[PDB]
Amino acid sequence: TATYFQSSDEHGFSMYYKPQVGFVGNPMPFYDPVAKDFKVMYLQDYRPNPEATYHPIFGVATKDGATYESLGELISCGGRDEQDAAIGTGGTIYNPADKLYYTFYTGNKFKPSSDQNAQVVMVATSPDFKTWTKNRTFYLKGDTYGYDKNDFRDPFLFQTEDGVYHMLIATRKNGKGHIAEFTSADLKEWESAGTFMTMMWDRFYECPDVFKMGDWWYLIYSEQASFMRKVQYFKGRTLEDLKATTANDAGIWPDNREGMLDSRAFYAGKTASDGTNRYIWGWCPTRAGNDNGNVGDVEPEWAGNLVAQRLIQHEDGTLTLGVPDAIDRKYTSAQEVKVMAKDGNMIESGKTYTLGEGASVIFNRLKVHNKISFTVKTASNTDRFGISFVRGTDSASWYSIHVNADEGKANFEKDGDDAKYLFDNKFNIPADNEYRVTIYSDQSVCVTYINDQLSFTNRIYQMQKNPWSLCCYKGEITVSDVQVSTY
Ligand SMILES: OC[C@H]1O[C@@](CO)(OC[C@H]2O[C@@](CO)(OC[C@H]3O[C@@](CO)(OC[C@H]4O[C@@](CO)(OC[C@H]5O[C@](O)(CO)[C@@H](O)[C@@H]5O)[C@@H](O)[C@@H]4O)[C@@H](O)[C@@H]3O)[C@@H](O)[C@@H]2O)[C@@H](O)[C@@H]1O
Ligand SMILES: OC[C@H]1O[C@@](CO)(OC[C@H]2O[C@@](CO)(OC[C@H]3O[C@](CO)(OC[C@H]4O[C@@](CO)(OC[C@H]5O[C@](O)(CO)[C@@H](O)[C@@H]5O)[C@@H](O)[C@@H]4O)[C@@H](O)[C@@H]3O)[C@@H](O)[C@@H]2O)[C@@H](O)[C@@H]1O
Ligand SMILES: OC[C@H]1O[C@@](CO)(OC[C@H]2O[C@](O)(CO)[C@@H](O)[C@@H]2O)[C@@H](O)[C@@H]1O
């Protein structure tokens, strides 16, 4: 049957990682060049969190983004009255001169008085990546260098080719958002190098990441602004080009979509490279009440599952995201695809499904970890189609990704009774009106990829062990090479 079944998530996720207890907050991926793998520290979130002492740094290890190994608690919160009562995002770097990993992080004071610093950067080190010792005498207060007392967080650490260590910190100078730069030769003495970049208008870029890839410098960052809540980027051929993008609010977007790389279900993305590939890790939020259509009024729930994506540099230096090769390989078992139900103008024809304005086709039940591929050809580039999940033959409501070629964007929406728009993901519509679609699922977390242009993370409770559906809202489509694979 293709009746709606009441699926639920396992405590843990193995690919779009979540530990057995708690959720994955802001990650901090780092390629450990001694062990030759990625150590992804992340802020461990719990439901609920302590009031003052929350968000310790746990870690997980992976070579490839598909299989993870948990490392447990690495840097504990401080005491209730310490400056690092709560811990916020930071940045690891290995120092070969003393054979110590250094993790800089945000210490978050509980109930800071007016004079006290809410947010201060602090550090721990480790010889193996297992035992971490806090440096109880190191504090980097923005205040000291003319920056903000309470917004001063998310230290990012990188070494240029000159060998100099740099640290970028999300802050404000008299109201306006600035990314602050500090430099050091030895990771211990730090000097202020002024402002690296301005933040546009009244925006606030959390979790900044700066890296070079081919012949381009990039800034990745997550936008705090309530209406955005998406991972964005800028680019420049030189480091001075990069900085110039936001200078005086110059708005030099890297592409036709403001550099928005995904939508509001992928936040806090930061990157790391193994020499071959550069991946990005963010989190896919939970939803209140496990309700796919409750996406928050101002903001999504903070933290959820870890989501690895792969950076695709195009030849104009523009970036999009696709799947990690190792996640694609994980799906070994082919599954029969078969129509369980039709509606309106819908024709099957050997192994090709043709749908017109208002038509629907529902396929057989998915499994728990799914890969879904298919090619869609539209009539025009004003056509609209839908990829729907948790859609049983008895479901009055369900959740679809709408691809609206007229509006040059995909949307996540609730369909049926109580339909509603939720949010969207601008991408480049194919000229040839062909859409090579690929979707990867671990339980309730999935990413949808089209034509190496779209990368759309979504939280979809109960997509597992439930049917899925294609439809056509406008014009006409033709669906081809439909496959489903599992593990
Ligand atoms: O009241 C505590 C309670 O709130 C949550 C759920 O939102 O956590 C946020 C809480 O975590 C901290 C300490 O680890 O670190 C946050 C790290 O995450 C980043 C990027 O996501 O930003 C914070 C995130 O929080 C919001 C919450 O709505 O922060 C709003 C808050 O930010 C300030 O600017 C000061 O933090 C205030 O102006 C404002 O009232 C959201 O808009 C942001 O995206 C990184 O930037 C950061 O390192 C704290 O900074 C934060 O308060 C629960 O998990 C927890 O139980
Ligand atoms: O209400 C937000 C909703 O808009 C939708 C619904 O249609 O839009 C978000 C969507 O819109 C863009 C389109 O570019 O921009 C959003 C802008 O909102 C803000 C906040 O007000 O813009 C103000 C506006 O003023 C300029 C000056 O010519 O600037 C002055 C500027 O300088 C400062 O003084 C500080 O230096 C600031 O305080 C002032 O704001 C204009 O250029 C500027 O555009 C800006 O932060 C954004 O411009 C998209 O970027 C965004 O995705 C819906 O999605 C939202 O819910
Ligand atoms: O009421 C939602 C309904 O609005 C539309 C109207 O065409 O789109 C979204 C609208 O919001 C932005 O994302 C940013 O302001 C823009 O991309 C766009 O102008 C529909 O698509 C949706 O179905």
Residue numbers in the entry: 17 to 503
The authors write:
Glycan uptake across the bacterial outer membrane (OM) of these bacteria is mediated by SusCD protein complexes, comprising a membrane-embedded barrel and a lipoprotein lid, that is thought to open and close to facilitate substrate binding and transport. Here we show that for both the levan and dextran utilisation systems of Bacteroides thetaiotaomicron, the additional OM components assemble on the core SusCD transporter, forming stable glycan utilising machines which we term ‘utilisomes’. Transport-competent FOS are generated from levan by a surface-exposed lipoprotein, a GH32-family levan endo-glycanase (GHlev), while an SGBP (SGBPlev) is thought to recruit levan at the cell surface. Single particle cryogenic electron microscopy (cryoEM) structures in the absence and presence of substrate reveal concerted conformational changes that demonstrate the mechanism of substrate capture, and rationalise the role of each component in the utilisome.
The density is compatible with ~12 β2,6-linked fructose units in an extended conformation, with a putative β2,1 decoration on Frc-7. Indeed, secondary binding sites are relatively common in endo-acting GH enzymes, where they may enhance substrate processivity. Single substitution of aromatic residues (to alanine) near the GHlev active site (Y70A and W318A) decreased affinity for levan 25-30 fold, while equivalent substitutions at the tethering site FOS4 had a 6-fold decrease in affinity (W217A) or no effect (F243A and Y437A). These results suggest the active site (FOS3) is responsible for most of the affinity of GHlev for levan. However, numerous weak interactions within the extensive secondary site (FOS4) including polar residues, may result in a substantial overall affinity and specificity.
